A paper describes a structure:
An example of challenging structure determination, CalO6, a dimeric Dnrk family O-methyltransferase, was crystallized in the absence of a cofactor or a substrate. The crystal structure of CalO6 was determined by a combination of molecular replacement by using diffraction data collected with native crystals with single anomalous dispersion (SAD) using an EMP derivative, as described in Materials and Methods. Locations of all mercury sites were consistent with covalent Cys modification. Crystals of CalO6 belong to space group R32, with one monomer in the asymmetric unit. The entirely helical N-terminal domain of CalO6 (residues 1 to 105) is involved in dimerization, and the C-terminal Rossman-fold domain (residues 162 to 356) containing the SAM-binding motif, is involved in substrate binding and the catalysis of the transfer of the methyl group from SAM onto a hydroxyl group of the substrate. A normally helical region between these two domains (residues 106 to 161; called a middle domain in some studies), which forms a part of the substrate-binding pocket in other methyltransferases, is disordered and not visible in the electron density map (as indicated by a dashed line in Fig. 4a). As a consequence, the substrate-binding pocket in CalO6 is much more open than in other O-methyltransferase structures. CalO6 appears to be the most extreme case, where the entire middle region is disordered or is in different positions relative to the rest of the protein in different CalO6 monomers in the crystal. The N-terminal domain is oriented at a different angle with respect to the catalytic domain from that seen in other methyltransferases bound to SAM, opening the active site even further.
Residue numbers in the entry:
A (entry chain A), B (entry chain A): 11 to 124, 162 to 346
Write the structure that this text describes.
Amino acid sequence: GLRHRMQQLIYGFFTAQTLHVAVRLRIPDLLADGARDVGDLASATGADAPSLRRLLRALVFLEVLDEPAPGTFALTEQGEVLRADVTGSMRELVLLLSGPESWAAWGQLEHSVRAFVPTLLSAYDFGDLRTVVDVGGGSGALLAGVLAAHPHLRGTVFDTPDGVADAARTVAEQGVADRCGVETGDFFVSVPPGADAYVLKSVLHDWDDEQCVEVLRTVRRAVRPDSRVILVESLMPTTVTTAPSVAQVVMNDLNMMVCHGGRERTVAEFRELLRVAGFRLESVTPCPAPSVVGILEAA
Amino acid sequence: GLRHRMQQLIYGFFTAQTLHVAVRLRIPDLLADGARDVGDLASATGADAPSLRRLLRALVFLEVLDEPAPGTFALTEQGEVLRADVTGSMRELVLLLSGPESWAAWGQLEHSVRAFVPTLLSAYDFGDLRTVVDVGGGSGALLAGVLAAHPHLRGTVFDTPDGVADAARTVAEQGVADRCGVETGDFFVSVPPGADAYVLKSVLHDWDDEQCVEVLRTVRRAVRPDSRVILVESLMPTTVTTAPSVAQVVMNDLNMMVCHGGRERTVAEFRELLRVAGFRLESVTPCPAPSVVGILEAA
Ligand SMILES: [Hg+2]
Ligand SMILES: [Hg+2]
């Protein structure tokens, strides 16, 4: 009853590995149309055959596959997610299992000792606005959509090249011929714009904790005041905590505690982070229940 | 809905690691009586405090703990299993997370390319028997209980010393003064006993696959025929497969596919394994539903 849960929790390496190594020679793709026996399977693989059997079972146990009749096997609609289609939730497993991630997390205890594009932002409403300045835009994803959205508003970007700086045919492509106003360089530089509203997308997500404080020191040391600082982020459940859903926040906090930087602040951990770093709270507003996406907005 | 399952399956490293590193400075033990705040907690640990918070959460998410009021935390009856009491299901996590196990499984894909004591055996019934010979006994666990059980039956063992060979005060301790008849050495040696019944406990469990064949070649090349070869084992679901329970077999197969040797044969994979290795099937009989423990018995 309870042990069941604990083991199931404690045996995560098993569960984790088996899926990666199933898509590793994309097993599902063989069974998308259909494939039977371990023998027909083992031809188009390499590996062992009667010690590959010991994996088909493991999959079938984890419910990703299902042997309908003795030996011979099919796959489940969960196992449908692993082909490279609609979701293609297998790139996910591939990166979360190669030594880059899987071997890194092995010694993660020590660290405890030591293409998104919001039209959600068209519920903030830039509906009396002339200028904006996207801080560390990079791709030209929002910038496009937002200056596309509001035909009279204009804008600016600043990111170093070699940080997804393929703006070339994206601020240009799709209408915004004027209103690129593009700059270069880091966010660690004191930002020369003093022009209406300021936008920072899923960016503490990238940052550390007092990295966030000093990149926001670099704004209000020469922000044009009496205007709005937007920052869109994933938050962390200050709502309460719970089990179901939520998840993504928790084990991406620890993922980025290992795989590069990122940590997750709650509501109040942004309020105090702003109040000392020269910013003043105002309203906050999330996405619907399926996500944690939150448009923060302090003055 | 489904993604939920897949992620939950694919994110096993997270789940796996967090529990080990919670008992690693036995957090639960602090909260068995009671402990509050991250600050009182962090004194009796080391580590960080506001980057230890990022773990308490993770535990509380995985439901092992539960923060009742802002910050301050308690633990759950699942988290009760991790202290070192009744079950003490934390030694489990400690060995399944240190580099010996956790780092070993990291590259386990390649391998795919390349104190129990049955009174259950007092349902086989030695109830017309005089002699027995426990093959590779070692500890003197059954030998004791069984020659203790039946006052007139007598027996023998053979195991190399330095393989839990603390028989000294166990065949002796608890009544069986006579009927030790103890020998030494490997099972790879041709076994000199030709004396009634032969017993092999959870031993393919230890073995490989054709290691099993030749250690049973070493029996019938000089077994006294017309008698019974007992071997007690964990089987593998030839019943069907399923999800709930079962589990232990599946991810101990792969555990021993990494952590030393062991693989799991089903019913028919023992029948053919015996039929060529000079043994003849007869009855099989398991433990109840909670386990897979099976007393095989071929003539
Ligand atoms: Hg990664
Ligand atoms: Hg181990």
